[PDB]
DNA sequence: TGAGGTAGTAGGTTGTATAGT
DNA sequence: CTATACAACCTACTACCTCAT
């Protein structure tokens, strides 16, 4: 076996408890209040006065050497008030603040190649290295032929206990940038248009998109009122335009769309936001490079934090601080307690399978009963790939052979399916209108002849004429039919390939045709605990004011989907009733009535976005049914990563290990190997309950296993996993009834 | 949209650790 | 009993990669 650990550093050495200097803020413009304007107050007296360290406590406000107060500052006003030595073990933010800052000081004068200097510092937990590790542990630049920076983004984050003892907590994570702006990228004469960029001098939040460039230049009075070298001589921003020289001022306006209003900015100024379309579709040699970069392991990741630690150094502010250049041997040190999960045993139609791939020689669990007849839509200038296409897929369905031949790997009948080529309906459609695609849908649903669509889709990428995927998925969501659509590259892949490249994908496509017809593939044989039904809960947040209603989902100790339940009153805010928890519950103990004849006596409720409120609520609504039961908070992206260790070499974990402490636990559940990436584990911690936490996570684990629509398994466990896809397909379901299609999939 | 994973980019909210009072 | 900030959380979107029983 092995071990575990975080990223994490010890420090060598201990804080002394350090002499401060308080201070005092007074709201003397137009905030009255402190709280508002510390922050700015913080930095305004950090600014000015040569970087030195300037923290805050909840009201006050502090230093650490002598510094003249001042009070020309038009916000507030800033006074000394007394000078002392605060006590460590008092303390923990306030010299996380101290160590912090050190660190960013004793980087701040680390140079690269020279000249360069390897880190940008704004003093904060967020450290940008210029420079990049590479594999072969080169501090090397990361640029482009174009213009584009890849970049480090460390952080740091260290706590520093009552004795004074520092621990120092990283995640290197990476960073896009490019020197250009929307000047340079109009003197180079690129198309600028319909680009995302991001505003470099004001901070403003928003995605702000280009939607056209004015001709006329910028030093001119525009409808903003006044000339735009005014407009930043106006906000103290002027050093910004007394670099421009003569060229800069022929630059023409580029006017940005925030959502909100109109904005009329300096291309000088904007900047596009460099995500990996803007790099694909601008120079692709360099995204395929640096995906081998962006993507990290957990031994490059330990390789990368190891050359930013050993760029800490030893800080001589600090009594010598230093942080050790090696993770934890074991996160018992650290407060975390590791394990592996052993891997769920599944079953099919005959018993125990070794693998997920064994079920097409098995059989499903269960199939819905009846027969499922096609139906095909397909373009019309795709034609005779897609006749091979569905070919393939009904020979795999319903004959078990694949490309005509017949093999042990795959067994007959394994979708009770009807599809009679000659006989059953296809549709093609031209690659058009909107409105050509909806009345396409609705012209394979007037025959009815049909119990399951298989489209055939355009590939998500090559932007002329669009995707006839969201329509389809409307049309046949409204009108309860399940479609599994598939794109015309997969088509061709099935057409044209005589290799296993189209059996991978037509496993996929098999369980999600048996998954949307209402069969589920595998179960586990046993879950671990006493536990009769699981009920995942998950609630969403498109943007700001907008709130998903709670949709839930309903397992058996098995684990097959009995039932998924949208509720019928919509919530308000983000905080769903007690009506819709009654209704919810209320059915899902029908349902697994129905389907057990029996009450469920043990009730594991996964939730995620669900607070430690509305706990009275389920003590109430379980303690007057009296059915004992657990509620597992499940979190789908916790930024904490998980190594592992055999005999200090750094690799990623397996999929299965854990590490706990008390109620919290994280949970690498994915089997990614190197030059992927690195595992992202489940944070899990327990709101209420009564079963331990090896079992709770057994039983998390056993549902990512569980995935009935794909061959991998799904990282997120099946119940917050699909509550989360049901909710964001909030309208593919019907109002407030129950299904078991699982149309999501 | 075969499927799932990583990771970027961008933007919101807010439960819990944490100071006084 | 109450007022924070802020590390975590959530959300949306792509691109890249690999699927072996
Ligand atoms: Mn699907």
């Not at 003397?28 to 406590?57: E, L, T």
């Not at 800069?248 to 769309?257: F, G, Q, S, T």
């Not at 031994?299 to 800490?312: A, G, H, P, Q």
């Not at 040190?333 to 139609?349: F, H, N, R, T, W």
Request: glycine share 6%; net charge positive.
């Amino acid at each position: 076996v092995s071990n575990l650990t975080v990223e994490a550093f010890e420090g060598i050495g201990s804080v002394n408890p350090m002499l401060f200097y308080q201070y005092k803020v007074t709201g003397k413009g137009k905030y009255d209040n402190v709280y508002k304007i510390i922050k700015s107050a913080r930095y305004k007296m950090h600014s000015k006065n040569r970087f030195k360290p300037v923290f805050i406590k909840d009201d006050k406000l502090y230093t650490l050497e002598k510094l003249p107060d001042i009070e020309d500052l038009d916000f507030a006003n800033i006074n000394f008030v007394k000078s002392e030595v605060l006590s460590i073990e008092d303390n923990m933010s306030i010299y996380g603040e101290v160590v912090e800052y050190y660190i960013n000081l004793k980087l701040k004068k680390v140079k690269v190649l020279g000249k360069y200097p390897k880190y940008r510092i704004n003093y904060s937990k967020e450290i940008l290295s210029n420079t990049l590790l590479t594999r072969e542990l080169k501090d090397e630049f990361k640029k482009s032929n174009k213009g584009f920076n890849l970049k480090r983004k460390f952080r740091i984050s260290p706590v520093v206990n009552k004795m004074g003892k520092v621990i120092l907590y990283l995640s290197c994570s990476a960073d896009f940038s490019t020197n250009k702006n929307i000047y340079e990228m109009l003197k180079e004469g690129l198309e600028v248009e319909g680009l995302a960029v991001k505003s470099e001098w004001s901070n403003i939040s928003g995605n702000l998109v280009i939607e056209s460039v004015l001709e006329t230049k910028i030093s001119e009075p525009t409808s903003l009122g006044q000339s735009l070298i005014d407009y930043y001589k106006n906000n103290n921003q002027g050093y910004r335009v007394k670099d421009f020289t003569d060229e800069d001022l022929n630059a023409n306006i580029v006017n940005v769309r925030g959502n909100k209003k109109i904005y009329m900015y300096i291309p000088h100024a904007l900047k596009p936001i460099i995500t990996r379309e803007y790099l694909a579709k601008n120079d692709p040699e360099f995204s395929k490079e640096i995906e081998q970069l962006i993507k990290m392991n957990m031994n490059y990741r330990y390789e990368t934090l190891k050359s930013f630690v050993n760029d800490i150094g030893v800080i001589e502010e600090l009594n010598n601080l230093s942080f050790k250049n090696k993770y934890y041997e074991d996160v018992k040190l650290l407060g975390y307690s590791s394990g592996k999960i052993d891997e769920p045993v599944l079953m099919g139609a005959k018993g125990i399978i070794k693998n997920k791939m064994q079920i097409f020689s098995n059989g499903f669990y269960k199939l819905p009963e009846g027969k499922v007849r096609f139906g095909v839509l397909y373009p019309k200038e795709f034609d005779g790939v897609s006749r091979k296409a569905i070919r393939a897929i009904y020979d795999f369905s319903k004959e078990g052979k694949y490309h005509g031949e017949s093999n042990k790997y795959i067994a007959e009948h394994l979708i009770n399916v009807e599809f009679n080529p000659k006989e059953c309906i296809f549709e093609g459609y031209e690659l058009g209108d909107i409105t050509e695609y909806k009345k396409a849908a609705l012209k394979l649903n007037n025959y009815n002849n049909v119990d399951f669509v298989i489209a055939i889709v355009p590939n998500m990428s090559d932007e002329e004429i669009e995707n006839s995927y969201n329509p389809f998925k409307k049309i046949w969501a409204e009108l309860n039919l399940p479609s599994q659509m598939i794109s015309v590259k997969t088509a061709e892949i099935f057409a044209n390939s005589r290799d296993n490249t189209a059996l991978y994908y037509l496993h996929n496509i098999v369980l999600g045709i048996l998954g949307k017809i209402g069969g589920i593939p595998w179960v586990v044989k046993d879950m671990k605990g006493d536990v009769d039904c699981f009920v995942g809960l998950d609630v969403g947040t498109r943007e700001k004011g907008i709130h998903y209603p709670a949709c839930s989902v309903v397992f058996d100790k098995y684990g097959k989907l009995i039932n998924y339940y949208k509720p019928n009153i919509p919530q308000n805010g983000e905080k769903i009733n007690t009506e819709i928890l009654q209704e919810i519950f209320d059915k899902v103990l029908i349902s697994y009535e129905e389907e057990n004849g029996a009450y469920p006596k043990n009730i594991v409720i996964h939730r995620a976005g669900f607070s430690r409120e509305d706990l009275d609520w389920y003590e109430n609504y379980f303690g007057k049914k009296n059915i004992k039961f657990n509620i597992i908070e499940v979190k789908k992206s916790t930024p904490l990563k998980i190594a592992s260790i055999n005999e200090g070499n750094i690799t990623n974990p397996e999929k299965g290990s854990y590490i706990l402490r008390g109620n919290k636990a994280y949970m690498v559940t994915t089997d990614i190997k190197e030059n992927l990436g690195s595992p992202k584990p489940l944070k899990i911690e327990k709101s209420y309950g009564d079963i331990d936490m090896l079992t709770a996570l057994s039983q998390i684990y056993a549902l990512t296993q569980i995935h009935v629509g794909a061959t991998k398994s799904l990282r997120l466990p099946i119940t917050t996993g699909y509550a989360d896809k049901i909710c964001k397909a909030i309208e593919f379901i019907p109002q407030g009834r129950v299904d078991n299609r699982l149309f999501f999939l």
